[PDB]
């Protein structure tokens, strides 16, 4: 999930936008 | 601001800024 | 902190604090 | 939506929790 991709690893715009509506 | 470790309110803040009027969903973990 | 007008990042912050590990969805608007 | 209930009117815990997962 987003915590694994952005908190415990380095986040990216690409990944953040996966969680936009 | 997005290319770093972002946790908790820091991550929520990034979603808010990036997603804008689209909104977003956040779930911890 | 919840019983007031809450807009933008202020509203997102309240959702984050209240919802905890449940997570939440935010849409503007 | 949540903006109408919490931003342009006074928010409540009751309403916020409607948007928790
Ligand atoms: Na920006
Ligand atoms: Na609290």
UniProtKB/Swiss-Prot annotation, chains B, C:
Shown part of the complete sequence: 25 to 53 of 110
UniProt-reported outcome of changing residue 24 to S: In HPRI; Los-Angeles
Lineage of source species: Eukaryota, Metazoa, Chordata, Craniata, Vertebrata
Gene: INS
Protein name: Insulin B chain
